[PDB]
Design a binder for these strands. Structure first.
Ligand SMILES: [Zn+2]
Ligand SMILES: [Zn+2]
Lengths: 94, 62, 83, 111, 97, 83, 147, 94, 109, 83, 98
DNA sequence: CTGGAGAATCCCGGTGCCGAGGCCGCTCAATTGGTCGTAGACAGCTCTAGCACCGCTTAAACGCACGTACGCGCTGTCCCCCGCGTTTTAACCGCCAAGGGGATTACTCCCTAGTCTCCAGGCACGTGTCAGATATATACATCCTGT
DNA sequence: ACAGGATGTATATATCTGACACGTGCCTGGAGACTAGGGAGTAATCCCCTTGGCGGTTAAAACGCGGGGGACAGCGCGTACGTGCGTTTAAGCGGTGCTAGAGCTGTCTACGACCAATTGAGCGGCCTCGGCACCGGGATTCTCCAG
């Protein structure tokens, strides 16, 4: 009875936000879960290396900005940074 | 006197409680009075012994 | 406990031909049906030798999907859809 | 009385679980300590990437006149967009197929 | 009777197989090959059907990519017929040998 | 088409800033707004369409690389009949 | 510059005044406004008139305004400070809506409080547990302060 | 006055144990240091991922054996495992 | 006044610093806790690999009639051995040059 | 403040010829030089972009050797000899 | 009498020459100018360590030599000895750079 | 196919320089000795899934004939690239000088780890209906041989 | 080019079904309040390496000219591979049956973090000479044109 976790609920919510009337197959949901895990590991590993290179001991949004800039290409990285900073600003505003 | 909040300077003399300072902050900026707190309501500035040019800090709002 | 080596011939000439057809190949010379199954076993050996050592380190007897996924990932061939 | 529970994701206006991301970060042995804004930033980035993939996938599905996204649609969405293709150049999608293209030399031609 | 001139059936097969996503290798012989290969690293090993499917998916994708590269090599050599020289050249350039 | 070939001031004004359309950008949802309002509201709030909530992120990234954002036809039409 | 949009919105509001609610600047500052609303019919707040405050941030219409209650009221989704927990003010903000819709939404929340995300836990508990008690207390406080 | 570390002393000791009458350039020593750090990072990264995969929290020699088997190819891996096991046996002896 | 200090590398009869490797492991954010034999095994592996590379490089140097190992000798040693070449196939060595080879088609005949 | 351009011609035709000769190239066409200019510019743009990001993350105006080493290492072309 | 070698004969000798030396083949001053010119487009008035510029040159030259090996192999595969820009494109495309 | 000139390459020797190698503080990071909590080893029990088998259908593999298009060789052209000499340019080296910025130390303070308590959001489990698959009979586009 | 015949191929309609979108119970992981402490921001200072400049040498780049060999188009020939048709054969399905091993829980203990006290191994500095670069000169080889 080990309860396992995934991102299916959040993926479904985002899908409903983008296309209000489109479903997703069960096998496609697993692919989305693998994609989410892979990107999470890439970004977290890059941030850890940045923090170790700069003799720090904390991973902050400053490190994740740089990690996103390194990993994502071009305009995708620009939009991702724009999205991340906006969310951090809103979070700190409350 | 002068009062610093950490920023609109300066504010009331050592004569108005926290509630009036928060109301004036809301009037001058739009930030809610109760949001979020004061770090340094019914308390005053002399009760905390707040001198001029003191550095203040200004949760519930969701 | 008796698997022979004939299974390499299991990958048939029509199977390789339709794989190439998906790959966009117009016509195929006859010598390819041996070169491709030579390549495929080399690829599979590299992947399986990494899956089996994962299973050994886990002290298991069966090869799980995550073992193969990790073996592929460490070769820069990440695979989605199995975990 | 203490307070009502508002999720950090709701604070940031996100959909991905900020708390879960924070737990994964601080349990993944990535650094000794984790900043406060790091999970907020990471969750937003992940949500943006998933939304970007899903928009194209849904467009491909509706171009195929179907209402459920299948991995074929994900592959078609990924391999068409240049940015996502370069991001996921070394990724194989199960049941994904390939993008239909034929070299112009092989097409028949004469008179 | 009727007779398609050579090449047209190949083109229609290309269009057909580039539109579908099915596994192109027979499952049972592929499983037998996998079990034969793995039988030397360790004896009496066991496999999950999901693991075998993952292996087959990866192998088919790798072969399709190899053929995509080897077709461009043969075209560059001013031919339309693939031959093992092209496979060797593609493997060598991709750093696999 | 905007409409139109003669976009009277009520239409020639931006749907948001209500000023004269300066370098209008036609969204995939066919909504027309000036370059300032667009370049503000894109990264300002939610990357969505203010009018019909349409996501434009893929369209925006598609057009930004090629610099195809500004509607050249309507932007030229406005210059012919308006300053 | 948000001044053009603020003035245009005020001009339209003057062109089409509301029925139960009213607002506008109460001075030369277009950023600071006072809103006056009446208790919607068939509500415990009916009869009382509520005055609201507005502080426009310098990005309108692309940012939500700072609006709260200057009239003490009994509502779950409203705190003792008069703040209003509403999506169009927090998340559902869009530059393509008018202040009249905001006031109508406020009146709707007055008629339809949301105890899922309240501002006072006790008021939400009363609203969920005893609707009649909530209707009585809201009416009593409307008479005491809003009247 | 930062005290920085490398492996130059140990590289020189091994070089004198292998070729007792051979010198090494300063730049070659830097290359050896870079190689040592690179291999160390490879092995440690593989062992960490193995420990995470198998739900452990302790990196032991058991994980390092598997990391070496995964990284080094063929005969090199066999010899390295043989070398490592002997050293661990001798260390545990005393 | 307790006992004479013996390094763990001396206990295992190694050359690389077992203590330094152990410190690097636990300060490297690789895992929460580190087993006792992990630095011993890792140091043994690194010492063996360095010994292999140095042996090949010294052979290459004496084939070039020199006494000091230079990056050219390391490149020649690495590229000739198949195992090391595959191990470091993605590695660029400064001042390394390339292995001298000319395709047989280009030779005059 | 010392704006400069047109440095791509600094990679002279004899220099490209010398590189190709080390590569083991006997005869060279005339169109190789411009395309080699393009390829080298692309590669340097991709490396320096990451190097500068590494530098400015640490908030200093000087690009160090370790930054270039990391930028190369993260592109799968590890380089030895610089720490 | 003017003594001349046959075409390609000096090409082979210089191939043997440059495959034995380990020096940098590009001129350092123009290479540094190019590196600074490229870096102008990310941050202004940046400063470089001389070791960093050297590392960039060392990486770039090795990358170009590796590219030339494969583009020579492709030209040979096409049954000719003169490398042409299509060969470079084929090599980069097979390697996955494009 | 067999020789001589010449150009390049290789080889040996005398010389001078500077970087590899060794020595010496010396300090700080490794070692040693305890203690204490707990992660993991190991036994035990359950039941899921993997392996083994059989039988019937039939789709897919296999084998054979043919002839046509494609690979490969040959030949001639010619034009573009190589070898070489002369002229030009700027890389390179040595040197001096200014200072901007990288590299330390102190301090303080604010941000994050840790603990505790509470509850709801996400997970495991049903469930019924509809998106999609399959069949069949269409229209309709496509190829191919003859004209 | 053209037309008709044969052949795939897209389309519309009908019907089944099982996979998903939904709902419910629940529990444990996330949120809230709190305290404590050290990681890091900030300031200040020092000096080292970067940048900028200049003059002189000369190695390298640019240009040019001739000619030759190689890329390329063309052509002819043979063969081997695609296309089709008929004849095997295991893949596939389905069903049943068994049990090995995966997965879980419960203990308990050996082991690794932690901290305090001690010292010597490695880092820095400081040399010194010898391995290597260089310069010249003779000896060997390799190419190429006449024969
Ligand atoms: Zn506008
Ligand atoms: Zn719209």
């Amino acid at each position: 009875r080990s309860r396992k976790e995934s991102y299916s609920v959040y993926v479904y919510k985002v899908l409903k936000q983008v296309h209000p009337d489109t479903g997703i197959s069960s096998k496609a949901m697993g692919i989305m879960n693998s994609f989410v895990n892979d990107i999470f590991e890439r970004i977290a590993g890059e941030a850890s290396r940045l923090a170790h290179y700069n003799k720090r001991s904390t991973i902050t949004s400053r490190e994740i900005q740089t990690a996103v800039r390194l990993l994502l290409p071009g305009e995708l990285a620009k939009h991702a940074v724009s999205e991340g900073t906006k969310a951090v600003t809103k979070y700190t505003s409350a | 006197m002068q009062i610093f909040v950490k920023t609109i300077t300066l504010e009331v003399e050592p004569s108005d409680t926290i509630e009036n300072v928060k109301a004036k902050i809301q009037d001058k900026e739009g930030i809610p009075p109760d949001q979020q707190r004061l770090i340094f309501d019914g308390r005053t500035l002399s009760d905390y012994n707040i001198q001029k040019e003191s550095t203040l800090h200004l949760l519930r709002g969701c | 406990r008796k698997v022979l080596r004939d299974n390499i011939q299991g990958i048939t000439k029509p199977a390789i031909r339709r794989l190439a057809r998906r790959g966009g190949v117009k016509r195929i010379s006859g010598l390819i049906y041996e070169e491709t199954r030579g390549v495929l076993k080399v690829f599979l050996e590299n992947v399986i030798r990494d899956a089996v050592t994962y299973t050994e380190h886990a002290k298991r007897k069966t090869v799980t999907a995550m073992d193969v996924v990790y073996a592929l990932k460490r070769q820069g061939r990440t695979l989605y859809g199995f975990g | 009385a203490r307070a009502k529970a508002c999720t950090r994701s709701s604070r940031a206006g996100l959909q991905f679980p900020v708390g879960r991301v924070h737990r994964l970060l601080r349990k993944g042995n990535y650094s000794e300590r984790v900043g406060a804004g790091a999970p907020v930033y990471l969750a937003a980035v992940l949500e943006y990437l998933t939304a970007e993939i899903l928009e194209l996938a849904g467009n491909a599905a509706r171009d195929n006149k179907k209402t459920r996204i299948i991995p074929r649609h994900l592959q078609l969405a990924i391999r068409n967009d240049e940015e996502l293709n370069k991001l996921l150049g070394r990724v194989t999608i199960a049941q994904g197929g390939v993008l239909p293209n034929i070299q112009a030399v092989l097409l028949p031609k004469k008179t | 009777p009727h007779r398609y001139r050579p090449g047209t059936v190949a083109l229609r097969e290309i269009r057909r197989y580039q539109k579908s996503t099915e596994l192109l290798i027979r499952k049972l012989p592929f499983q037998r090959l996998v079990r034969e290969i793995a039988q030397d690293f360790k004896t009496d090993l066991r496999f999950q059907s999901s693991a075998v499917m993952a292996l087959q998916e990866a192998s088919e994708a790798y072969l399709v990519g190899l053929f995509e590269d080897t077709n461009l090599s043969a075209i560059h050599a001013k031919r339309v017929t693939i031959m093992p020289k092209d496979i060797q050249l593609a493997r060598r350039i991709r750093g696999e040998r | 088409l905007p409409k139109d070939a003669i976009p009277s001031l009520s239409e020639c004004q931006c749907g948001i800033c209500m000023e004269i359309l300066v370098e209008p950008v036609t969204l995939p949802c066919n909504h027309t707004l000036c370059k300032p309002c667009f370049q503000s509201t894109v990264e300002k709030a939610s990357l969505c369409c203010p009018f019909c909530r349409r996501r434009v992120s893929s369209w925006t990234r598609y057009h930004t690389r090629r610099n195809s954002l500004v509607n050249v036809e309507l932007w030229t039409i406005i210059q012919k009949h308006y300053p | 510059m948000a001044l053009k949009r603020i003035n245009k919105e005020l001009s339209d509001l003057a062109r089409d005044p509301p029925a139960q609610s009213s607002a506008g600047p109460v001075g030369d500052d277009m950023f600071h406004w006072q809103a006056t609303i009446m208790g919607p019919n068939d509500s415990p707040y009916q009869g009382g008139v509520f005055f609201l405050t507005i502080h426009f941030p310098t990005d309108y219409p692309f940012k939500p305004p700072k609006v709260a209650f200057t009239t003490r009221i009994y509502h779950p989704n409203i705190n003792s400070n008069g703040s209003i927990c509403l999506d169009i003010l927090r998340s559902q903000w869009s530059p393509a809506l008018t202040i009249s819709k905001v006031l109508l939404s406020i009146s709707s929340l007055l008629s339809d409080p949301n105890p899922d995300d309240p501002l006072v836990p006790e008021i939400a508990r009363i609203y969920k547990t005893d609707r009649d008690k909530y209707n009585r207390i809201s009416r009593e406080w409307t008479q005491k302060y809003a009247m």
